[PDB]
Each structure stands twice: as C-alpha cells, then as structure tokens.
Amino acid sequence: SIVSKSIVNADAEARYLSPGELERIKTFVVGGDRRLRIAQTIAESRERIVKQAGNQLFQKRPDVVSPGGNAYGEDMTATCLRDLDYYLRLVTYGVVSGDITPIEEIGIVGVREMYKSLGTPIEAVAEGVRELKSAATALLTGEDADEAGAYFDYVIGALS
Amino acid sequence: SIVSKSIVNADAEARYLSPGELERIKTFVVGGDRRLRIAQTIAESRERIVKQAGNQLFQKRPDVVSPGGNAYGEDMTATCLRDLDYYLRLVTYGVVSGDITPIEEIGIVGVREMYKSLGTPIEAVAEGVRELKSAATALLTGEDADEAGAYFDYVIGALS
Amino acid sequence: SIVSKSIVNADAEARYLSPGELERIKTFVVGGDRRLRIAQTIAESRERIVKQAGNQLFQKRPDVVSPGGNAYGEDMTATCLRDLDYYLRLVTYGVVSGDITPIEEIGIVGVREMYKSLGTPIEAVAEGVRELKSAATALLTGEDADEAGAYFDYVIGALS
Amino acid sequence: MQDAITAVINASDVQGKYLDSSALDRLKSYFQSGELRVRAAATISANSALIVKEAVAKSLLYSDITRPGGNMYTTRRYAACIRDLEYYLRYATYAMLAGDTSILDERVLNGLKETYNSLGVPIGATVQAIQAIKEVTASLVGPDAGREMGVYLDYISSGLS
C-alpha cells in the first residue's frame, strides 16, 4: 500500500517520511471507507458478477467450451468460472489497498507460464475478466466505478 | 607506522619491500629514541600543559564557561580539560609512530557527530588544541618542537 | 569429451542440446573403438617407447645426463624417463576422450613453476616429448598416427 | 516488508476468502488511527536529533561506558552508538505507521543480537537507553501514540533481550 511504499523509499534514503509522503498517507486513509464499500459491493454480489461474466464470456467465445476447448464439460467449465472468481477476489484486494502489489504477487507473476502448460488460452481468460469488469462496474455509482475499473484493466492488460 | 604502511604497499603488489621502503624503515627506526624522549617530556608535564592551555582557552572564549555554556560549572569544565588531555595524549601517539592513523581511529573519526549531540562547539575544542600546542612546544626546542607541532596541527585542522 | 563440452554449452544457455551437438556426439562415439585401439597399442609397448625416446633424447642432450646436469645419475635419469612415461600415459587419455581437458589438468597447469623449482630445463622435456612422439606414432598405422600425434604436439607446445 | 493492509489481505488470501467481515473491521480501524500515527510520525521526525540527545543523557552518559576500555570510548564507537539509536527511533516510527513489525524483523533485528555480542556491545545498556527513547518520545507525542511507539521500541529491545 501507499504506506509501505513510502516506508520503502524513506528507508532507502535513510530518512523520515517527507511532508509529501505524509499528506498522501493522510488522504489515502481518509478515503478508507470509500474503498471498503466498493469491495463489499463486489464481494456481496460475487456470484451474480461471476456467473454473468461466464455467460457473456461463453457466447463471445463458444470455443473454449466446445469439444476440444479447455472448458468443455461441466467439471471444466466450473474450474474456469472458479478462476474468474479468483480474479474478482484479487481485484477487491487492490481496490482495498489502492495498490497493485497484491494482484501481482498472487495472480500475475507467472501466469503466462501457468496457463500455457495448462493448455488454457489466456486471451480468453482476459476476455472473462472483461465481462467481470462490466458486470461489476454495472453495480457501482460513478466515481466508485472509475476506481474499481482501474484494477480490472490492470489485470486485463497483464493477461493479454 | 612507516613499517606497517610500506608492508601494505608491498602486500598489495604481492612482492617483497623495495630498497626504498627498507631504507625508509631504517631511517625511521634509527630515530625512534628521539620520538620517545619527546613523548616522554610531554607526558611528564601533562598537568602543566593541560591546565595552562585551559586558562588561555577560557580567556579567549569566555562564553563556553559562562551560563548556558557547554562547560559551565566545575563539574563541566573538568570534563573539558579532560578532553584537552585526551588530545594531548593522542598527539604523543603520532609522534612516536610518525603516523597519523592512531589519532584518527581514536579521536577523529566521528568527532563531529559526538560533539554535536553533546552540544559542544567544535571550533572551541579546536582552539583548545591550539593552546595546548603552545603550552607543549613551549617545553620543546627546535626540531623536537616542529615535530610535535606538526601533529598538533593535524588535530587542530581535523577539528576546525 | 565432446559430451560434457556440449552439455556445458547447452547448460550455459539453459537449453537442450542443439542438433549439431548431438550429431557430434554420434560421430565421436561411433569412432570410439579406433581410439581405444590407439591407447591400447601405445600402452602395450610403453616400455619400448619411453626407453627409446630416452636414448635419442640423451643422445641429443648429452649435457642433461652428464655431470652437473639435472638428469645426471641413474637415480635422476630414472625419474626423467618416468616423466616421459607420464606424458605418454597422458597422451593416451587425450586420444581416448578426444579432449585435452585431461592432459591439461593433470600435467600442464603449473608445469612451468614445477620444473623451474626442480631446476629442470623445460625445453629439454619438450624435446623429450618429441622423441616419445615419433617413437609412438611409428608404432601406429595411417591416420592413427596423425591422431595420436596432434596430442603429442599439444604437450610439446605447452612445454615451451 | 509489509504494512497492516497487506497483512490482512494475505491472511484472507491463504484461505481463498474475499475480505472477511472481521478483516473489514480490522482494516477500517487501522484507517481511523491513520491520522494520529501521521501526526506523531511528524513530531518524532522534527525532534529526532533531540529525542536521541536527551535519551543518551538520562542514560548513556557519565557511566563507565564512555571511558577508556568501555564500548563507547573513542569518537569512533561513541558515534556508532548514537547512530544505532537513530535507527531504532526511525525504524520504530516506520513500524508504527505501518502497524506491522515486519520491517523491524527484516531490517533491524536480523542477526543483530549476534553482531552485538560479537563486537561486545553491552546489550543491557542499549536496552536501558532505548527505554529512555520511549519516555523521551512519549512526552513529546503522547501516551496515546507514545503508547504505540512504546510497544514498538519495546519490540526491538526484546529482539535483544
């Protein structure tokens, strides 16, 4: 988060936090609730968000789900939608900490190497997260939608 | 010393000392006695010196011992003369080794840090050494005096 | 050999062996027999080769075996001939592995410091290996002579 | 290194759960005390050189330590001691703003209790001195934040005790 990031820099320069790094921490915390709210709004419609994304994903790309595609079968489509749940959970983590280190350390570093051998087409995973993005920002107000949306796009770009 | 120094030069180039270094060692070792007499005369009169140089230091920087001064109060002036006595000792160490190394590792590296945190005026410590120089060379004549004085300078210069 | 050399290359690049490297392994391996033949014939006449190389050598190096010489005396001349047997054995290790990594590690690295402290004229040991060369190759037929001879050439050049 | 925000994120990630009801509470109350920690992190910075200078006095002064043969003797060692006092003060502040001791564990205490005993630093002294930092700093910020700085400074002492 912004707090640990400032600690990191100030420590690399053997110094106390600058007035600028303190203002930011003040402001990042003062907006804490805003963040929590956003996370809860998503977390509480977990299922609604995930299943919709699945529906859309599947229509735009009926491949992955036809015989021969990574998610064909019920077990298999279920593991796919489980993976979309994971990413939706990692998004709330970022929108909560206003930082992308968590999305990174958990679902980004090594993801291409993971899916590549899993035989999963990763362009498609990004697709799903895109639907996730719209299904979720659909339930948010304006500002809150801009915020949640940023973390969705980061994940998207990283998976595509 | 001039022995330990040339051994380093040699070790660095993986060779035996040069005729020049061995010769320089012979000249140094030969005059070792004189250096001992010099340090001896100074030790013997350490109490004259430190007390005399102390009065001159006050008559020039009367503030130091005045109220809100760093050395106000017998307790405190006591410590101030102790430091002049510390530096008069380190000076004899250089004279005998003809090496400045021992003054540094004992009372020069980190001095500013120390005096700063004790609230002592470093420029005032310097002239106390300038006074010490005067009360000590006083007992010395000639070359014996130029020798000691050179080290007093080094200390004075490293404290200013 | 070419096996470990090829592995070392591939491992540095963190890859599997190239098709070129595998081809060479095959070529080197298929010809393994011929090489063992050579080691074999050299070994079976080791006594005659050295003894004969030692004669022609002292015949041209009468100064090495005459008073004051390094190999003067039956105890010295004996060891001298034993060094010749040493290098002969080393050459067979080279031919077999088709590599000089063995000759190098066993009798080349530090060879000049070694002989200079024993007070032995290296040139002389190089000329000795020239004697071992013709004596051995002579015992081989055709191209087997040009094979074994390249290693003798290696040791010769290393000893001068 | 890690702050409370990540600490909570991770505790839930290890279970594959979304922010837990309890995690939101934990998180939220960390946000609320954010401004106090910043205010305190400011005065400690503005009075760091002073905090140490006073602590050394009520603690490492006129004892056997600074005389010839003790561990503070020589302007080299004396300086080295004060330096270490600054690290604890600054790192305690870092740890206080983060609400996590990981930065102390990673950048301060690691193979420190050893290094000390190796160079023969007088552990019990460095702790009596630290304690002085807690009191001196406490009087400037307040037992409210002094309360929390005490918890962290004590945390470095124990890493030595």
Added chain:
Amino acid sequence: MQDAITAVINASDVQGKYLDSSALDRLKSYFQSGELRVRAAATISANSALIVKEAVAKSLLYSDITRPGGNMYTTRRYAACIRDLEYYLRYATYAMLAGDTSILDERVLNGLKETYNSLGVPIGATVQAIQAIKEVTASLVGPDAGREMGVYLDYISSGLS
C-alpha cells in the same frame, strides 16, 4: 561436471595406471550406448513441455497443493514449481548423456534440500512429481532408455531426502 569417459580416466590416473582392458571395456560399453542416449535425449527435448505437463496433471493438480494454502498456490509458485520440474527433466537428460551424475551434484542438488526446507516446499510431493516425470518420459523413450532416465531422476529426488 564430468563425463563417463573422464570418470574412467581419473579412476585409473589416481592409480598412475594406463587404461587396462576392463577399463577399456567400460569405455567400449559407454560408446556402444552412445546413439541410444543421443536419441532418447532427442525425443525428450521435443516433448519436454508435454512430459512436465502430464506429470503435473497426474501429480499435483486439484489438490491441497494448488488450493489456497498449498505451496503451489499463486501463479508465482505454480510457475516456480513447473520450472523446477523442467529443470530436473533437463538436468536428468544431461546426466544421462554423460553417464555420470556429477552434473546433478554440482548444478542441481548442491544445497537444495535446505533451500526447500526453509521455504516450506513439500519434499514428498516434489518427489511424487519426479515419479510422474520418470513415468511419462519412459513412455516416450522406450523401456530401455526409460530405466536409464530413472537412475538420474532417482538420484535427484533421493538427493532431496
């Protein structure tokens, strides 16, 4: 890093001996096993991605290890684990070609067991994946070359225990 040929040479040099007939025979056989080695390594190379894949599939997927809380959780550790399996496979085929395990001891097992114990990496599970790799590769390389790959894959996991 040694070769079989070099291993044989050093064994006799420590004895100051010329290559003897049984020693020559050792080399003869290494040579005779040459093309079979430089071939199994060919197919292996071409199916290295597939081999590790079938090995993970039959070995680790869908279990405690992959779910939140296992050592194969996070894409980070998943890749890190696939990577290790690609390493063992490659280094095992290197050794095979050499007919000597020196490579594994130098480039592979040096300090591995600790390095894993300090990271919470499951020794028995990683060994299970090594069982799977041994199995998939043998089913591509043929029975003879399969046991030849089993000696080196065994040398690795057994070097973890």
Added chain:
Amino acid sequence: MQDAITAVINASDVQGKYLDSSALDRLKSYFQSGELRVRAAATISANSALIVKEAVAKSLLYSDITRPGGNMYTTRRYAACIRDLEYYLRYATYAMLAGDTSILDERVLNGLKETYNSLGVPIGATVQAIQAIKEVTASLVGPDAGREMGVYLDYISSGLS
C-alpha cells in the same frame, strides 16, 4: 594489520594512559632491532626462490606425497603447494618486519584450516615443510635473525593444526 608500535599504543589507549616506561621499553626494543629485521628481509627477498626450493627438496621430496593419487600429485597441485610455501615465506617476512602477527591472522590464517580440511590438503606435511623453511632461512639469515623468523613461521604453523 598493526605494527608492534601501534600494538603498544593501543594497549595503552585501552587503559587511557600515556606510554608507560614498560611501554617505552617495548618500543625501544623494537627500534633497536630494526636494522636486523630489514637486513633479514633483504636477504629473505633475494633468496626467496632458493629458500623454497631447498625446503621442498629437504622436507617434501622425501615422502610419498607425489605418487599419483597424491595430494601433491599432478603439476597443478605441485605448483599450488609451492605457491603456498612462497606465501608463507613472504607473509612471515611481512610479520617479522612488523614485529606483530596481526597480518598473519588477517591475511593468511583466516579460514585457512577449514579450507585445507575440505580440500584434503594434509596439515601434517605442510607443517613439516614450514619447518624446513624455518631451517633453510636461518642458514641464510644467521642464527639471530633466524630465531626471530622462526617465531612467525611457527605461528602460521601452529595456526592450522
């Protein structure tokens, strides 16, 4: 490293006092022995190659140590060992000048035994070689300066054991 001079100074500073008469005496004894040390060094320098050759031929070359398999076997190890002796002679010659053994602890002995141990370098034979160097240098340097060099050659020696 440190001279005997600096060695005396430090022993006094640790007591916070100016140089005692007993301290001046150590100093006087070092100064008056300078010519002897320099003259010894000059000789040990112009004869370092001969001193090593003779000590090798008189200690090590009367042992089995070079028969293949030997620790002194192979041209590489032969030179490696000759090089160590050279180091001993030079640094012992570094120490004698200095009248202090700090250079030996800092530049020659630190982790020397452990390295030899994990290398199989025999400590018994090295010690015997060093003593041969002690003896061969004494014959060139004289009995007086010979004894002084022995002190330092012995020191290295009794540091590996």
